[PDB]
Design a protein around this ligand. Structure first.
Ligand SMILES: CCCCCCCCCCC(=O)OC[C@H](COP(=O)(O)OC[C@H](O)COP(=O)(O)OC[C@@H](COC(=O)CC)OC(=O)CCC)OC(=O)CCCCCCCC
Ligand SMILES: CCCCCCCCCCCCCCCCCC(=O)OC[C@H](COP(=O)(O)OCCN)OC(=O)CCCCCCCCCCCCC
Ligand code: HEM
Ligand code: HEM
Ligand code: HEM
Ligand SMILES: COc1c(O)c(C)c(C/C=C(\C)CC/C=C(\C)CC/C=C(\C)CC/C=C(\C)CC/C=C(\C)CCC=C(C)C)c(O)c1OC
Ligand SMILES: CCCCCCCCCCCCCCCCCC(=O)O[C@H](COC(=O)CCCCCC)COP(=O)(O)OCCN
Ligand SMILES: Cc1cccc(-n2nnn(C)c2=O)c1COc1cnn(-c2ccc(Cl)cc2)c1
Lengths: 75, 385, 93, 50, 99, 54
């Protein structure tokens, strides 16, 4: 009947364009590595692209925005 | 005469803390030596009351420190005052040595007073290392592994000192049992060196911030400096109480709350904050034998200081160039502690190497050149010709 | 015991300075002076005067060592990012 | 090292026992043992607590 | 210890008596560890067989899966047992076990 | 003024009052500090939770 409060705030601060600037930046990374890893031949490689750096930039903004705002919603 | 001057025992108290002649212009930097006598008393008293509940076996050592924290009545006060008191003991001693480096207290006739002080500083480092290995945390095992492996590089005698320090083949149960017995003993050698320290002080007395003779204006110790000594004692106990009761694990490392394990290494091995400047001198030398020489030479280079100061005035009150290079040396010692807490990466292997060069070039190059320059500048700025 | 080697300090009466002649001194008891007179004109000004003399011998050595740390730090964060992945090579070895 | 090898940085929530004059919430200690007994004790020990 | 690694695919789950004081972060790290498992890993990473992604663990890959879900306990006082509510109460209890 | 042997004249009343007050102050400062602490944190102690499970 009541969902958990941390994932409610994690989408409400994804409804700002401060969030959409970092959502779209990580989705651009995901669609570059996936027209890759199906091109013919890898284990050729020694280094290739991840999206861990673009992941942490979106996670860091979400914790600056929800940390002072949460424990008044819990009991 | 009075009874306090004719008794055999009361006259020593009267000649040291009651009727002792003092220069009337000394400031609050001359209060650090009495405050170090209070620091030694707190460490001995709280450690004796904790030794009644401690076991030094390698399978009982970590859990007996937990027994003091949880079961002993007011046992958490004893440990927190002991672990935080050692950091306050090292902070005042860094301020004590820096005052005498500033006001010129190492020169004649106080050279013997400066040489006994260097011996106390080596015994205080050895004491804090031995007691940190007695908790037997995960930082205690790998800090004792790294240090004891340095003595295997001594030429033609290396696999003896290390097998005599271990009592076996690695850091094991004979190492922890003998480290606690030596930890009980060296605080009593330090207290005998403190008595010999105050004997060399009584025959010449203190200096002053002016740096000239003080035999023209003296006031007694009692009723004037006992109430000035009392001001910094109550400030000391209040800042110490703020750490023991409100932030007791700030000057520590959380990996010491894991029991030690010879089969798992930690991701980051970092000493306490007062050994970080000397840890960074060791990692700068790529050789193994030359690295252990340089880390011990960083304390024995304080004994060349009466010979390289070529100035004719004592202190740093009226010396413009010598006041500039005193704070180059201070902030280079705070940069050396920050390098020693970082990873070994490649902006930082060259920053920690040049900063070790500034440590040794201050004592042997910068001081004897800047000293003689100000002797000539004082002369030609006065002599009319 | 026997007397030992001589020093540069004595005791009350024979402290060991030059002979004095012609200096006078005066003082008044603490019970006659007003309580806490020198609390203003003291740190709000005096120590504001003593700071302004001796601060430039501290702040110029401090600024060189804080420029060196902040500039050396931000080159380490660049070398361990994705943009600084090729320059981590050819530098470390 | 890289930020992937160090781990993410935990933020600063507002716990009711932060501050120099604060006490534990003993109604949140009581409910915390109920989550230990039902979810957590299947794989973890609590060997220092009598 | 051999029976503990035998039921957890080689990994050893630690003792939780001093886990608050033995981690960089304290109460903030144990709370953010549990309520921090993503629904999917980031694109490009390759996990070992039998691993989970959690970005608060150094390295990214952890041997503990997500164990808290909604309405899995029922409190006696009547508090709604959500994911963040139950994760708040273990960290308050476990901080008392250390101190 | 004219209260000094009633206050702090005597050697045995300079130390015979600051030792006398050292226990009277010891119990009334202890009580008033404990009373302030358990009202700043009212509602979280075990005394308040045990009265809620009645
Ligand atoms: C962790 C250990 C805790 C215990 C440490 C004790 C304090 C160690 C600090 C080192 C030190 O003593 O340096 C003092 C230095 C020069 O001292 P000075 O004799 O020239 O100034 C006497 C003045 O006339 C007041 O002298 P006054 O007669 O007013 O004494 C009262 C004063 C006493 O408090 C202190 O000064 C304690 C330091 O309190 C008041 O001011 C009343 C205010 C309503 O003053 C300075 O130059 C300021 C430099 C800052 C030093 C920071 C050290 C870096 C770590
Ligand atoms: C081998 C190991 C040896 C130890 C190496 C040194 C370790 C560094 C320890 C840090 C504490 C040392 C800082 C203070 C050193 C003593 C300074 C001193 O003795 O006083 C000098 C000066 C007095 O002022 P004046 O007497 O010149 O006033 C004019 C009167 N005509 O008074 C002053 O100028 C004080 C000004 C403020 C000094 C503090 C500034 C911050 C220092 C950095 C501390 C960083 C801690 C992290
Ligand atoms: C100058 C004096 C001393 C210094 C600098 C010193 C230093 C230390 C330090 C730094 C620790 C580590 C504490 C921690 O990190 O938790 C320690 C531990 C310990 N010390 Fe001392 N110590 C001194 C005197 C003594 C003496 C005389 C004893 C006599 C029994 C003693 C008994 C202990 C004990 C029992 C421990 C056990 C572990 C613990 O309590 O944490 N100490 N010492
Ligand atoms: C447990 C350690 C120590 C104690 C108890 C101690 C105590 C004292 C005391 C009481 C004084 C009297 C003047 C004053 O109070 O400032 C003094 C002065 C002095 N100390 Fe120490 N000290 C210790 C360590 C050291 C160290 C480590 C050094 C130097 C490496 C040192 C060098 C000196 C010098 C040179 C003086 C004379 C300063 C002057 O008169 O101007 N001492 N010490
Ligand atoms: C419900 C409350 C639980 C809490 C608060 C909790 C907490 C923790 C913590 C703090 C760690 C250590 C993280 C670290 O080492 O940095 C850990 C590790 C672990 N836990 Fe739990 N846990 C819980 C339940 C469980 C359950 C039900 C399992 C069942 C299999 C489990 C299995 C593990 C394992 C295997 C590890 C080791 C992870 C690794 O070292 O990679 N835990 N847990
Ligand atoms: C102008 O220069 C000065 C000067 O400025 C000062 C301040 C002094 C003042 C002197 C000092 C500050 C010296 C400080 C003295 C020491 C450091 C002595 C060393 C201390 C000890 C050896 C500690 C003694 C050991 C104990 C008390 C053991 C305690 C254990 C107990 C009580 C356990 C009891 C157990 C049971 C079961 C009851 C000078 O003498 C002096 O020179 C003229
Ligand atoms: C490392 C060693 C440190 C060296 C110690 C130096 C500091 C010691 C003095 C500390 C204060 C101790 C003084 C005791 C009080 C004075 C004693 C006295 O009145 O002298 C004695 C009392 O006799 C005793 O029993 C001494 C007991 C010693 C107790 C030791 C704990 C009186 O002797 P007397 O009347 O002859 O005085 C000479 C007058 N011209
Ligand atoms: C390495 C390490 C790693 C982790 C914790 C520690 N450590 N050992 N003791 N303490 C208090 C401490 O932090 C240490 C030791 O660090 C250092 C640095 N220099 N020394 C040193 C210097 C001179 C002597 Cl005679 C003995 C030792 C010891």
């Amino acid at each position: 009947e009541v969902t958990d409060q941390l994932e409610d705030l994690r989408e409400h601060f994804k409804n700002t364009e401060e969030g959409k600037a970092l959502v779209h930046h990580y989705e651009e990374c995901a669609e570059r590595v996936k027209i890759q890893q199906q091109q013919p031949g890898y284990a050729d490689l020694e280094h290739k692209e991840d999206c861990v750096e673009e992941f942490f930039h979106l996670q860091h903004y979400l914790d600056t925005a929800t940390a002072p705002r949460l424990f008044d919603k819990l009991k | 005469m009075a009874f306090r001057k004719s008794n055999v025992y009361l006259s020593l108290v009267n000649s040291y803390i009651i009727d002792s002649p003092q220069p009337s212009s000394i400031n609050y930097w001359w209060n650090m030596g009495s405050l170090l006598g209070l620091c030694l008393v707190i460490q001995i008293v709280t450690g004796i009351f904790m030794a009644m509940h401690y076991s030094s076996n390698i399978e009982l050592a970590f859990s007996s420190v937990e027994h003091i924290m949880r079961d002993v009545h007011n046992g958490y006060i004893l440990r927190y005052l002991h672990a935080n008191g050692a950091s306050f003991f090292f902070m005042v001693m860094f301020m004590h040595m820096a005052k005498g480096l500033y006001y010129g207290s190492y020169r004649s006739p106080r050279v013997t007073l400066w040489n006994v002080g260097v011996i106390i500083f080596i015994l205080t480092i050895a004491t804090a290392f031995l007691g940190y290995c007695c908790v037997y945390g995960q930082m205690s095992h790998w800090g004792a592994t790294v240090i004891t492996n340095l003595f295997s590089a001594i030429p033609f005698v290396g696999n003896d000192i290390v097998s005599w320090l271990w009592g076996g083949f690695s850091v094991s149960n004979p190492t922890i049992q003998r480290f606690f017995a030596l930890h009980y003993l060296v605080p009593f050698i330090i207290a005998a060196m403190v008595i010999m320290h105050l004997m060399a002080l009584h025959i010449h007395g203190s200096s002053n911030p002016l740096g000239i003779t003080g035999n023209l204006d003296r006031i007694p110790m009692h009723s004037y400096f006992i109430f000035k000594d009392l001001v910094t004692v109550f400030l000391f106990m209040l800042i110490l109480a703020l750490f023991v009761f409100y932030s007791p694990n700030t000057l520590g490392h959380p990996d010491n709350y894991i029991p030690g394990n010879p089969l798992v290494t930690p991701a980051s091995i970092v000493p306490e904050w007062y050994l970080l400047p000397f840890y960074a001198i060791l990692r700068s030398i790529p050789d193994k034998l030359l690295g252990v020489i340089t880390m011990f030479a960083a304390i024995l280079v304080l004994l060349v200081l009466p010979f390289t100061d070529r100035s004719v005035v004592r202190g740093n009150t009226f010396k413009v160039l010598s006041k500039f290079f005193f704070f180059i040396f201070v902030f280079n010692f705070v940069l050396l502690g920050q390098i020693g807490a970082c990873h070994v990466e490649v902006p930082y292997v060259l920053m920690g190497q040049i900063a070790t060069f500034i440590y040794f070039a201050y004592f042997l190059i910068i001081v004897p050149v800047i000293s003689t320059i100000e002797n000539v500048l004082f002369y030609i700025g006065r002599v009319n010709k | 015991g026997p007397p030992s080697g001589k020093t540069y300090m004595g005791w009350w009466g024979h402290m060991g300075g030059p002979k004095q002649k012609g200096i006078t001194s005066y003082a008044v008891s603490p019970y006659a002076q007003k309580p806490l007179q020198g609390i203003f004109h003291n740190a709000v000004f005096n120590s504001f005067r003593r700071f302004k003399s001796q601060f430039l011998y501290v702040l110029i050595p401090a600024g060189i060592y804080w420029y060196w740390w902040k500039n050396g730090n931000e080159y380490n964060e660049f070398l361990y990012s994705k943009a600084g992945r090729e320059e981590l090579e050819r530098v470390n070895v | 090292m890289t930020a992937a090898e160090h781990g993410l940085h935990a933020p600063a929530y507002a716990w009711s026992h932060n501050g120099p004059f604060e006490t534990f919430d003993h109604a949140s200690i009581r409910r915390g043992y109920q989550v230990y007994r039902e979810v957590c004790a299947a794989c973890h020990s609590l060997d220092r607590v009598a | 210890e051999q029976a503990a690694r035998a039921a957890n695919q080689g990994a050893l789950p630690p003792d939780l008596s001093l886990i608050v004081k033995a981690r960089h972060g304290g109460c903030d790290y144990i709370f953010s560890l549990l309520t921090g498992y993503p629904d999917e890993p980031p694109a490009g990473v390759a996990l070992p067989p039998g691993s989970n992604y959690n970005p608060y663990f150094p390295g990214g890959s952890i041997a503990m899966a997500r164990v808290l879900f909604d309405d899995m306990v029922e409190y006696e006082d009547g508090t709604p047992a959500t994911t963040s509510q139950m994760a708040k109460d273990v960290t308050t209890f476990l901080n008392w076990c250390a101190e | 003024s004219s209260l000094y042997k009633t206050f702090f004249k005597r050697n045995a009343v300079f130390v015979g009052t600051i030792f006398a007050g050292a226990f009277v102050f010891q119990t009334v400062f202890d009580t008033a500090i404990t009373s302030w602490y358990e009202n700043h944190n009212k509602g979280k102690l075990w005394k308040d939770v045990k009265a809620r499970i009645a």
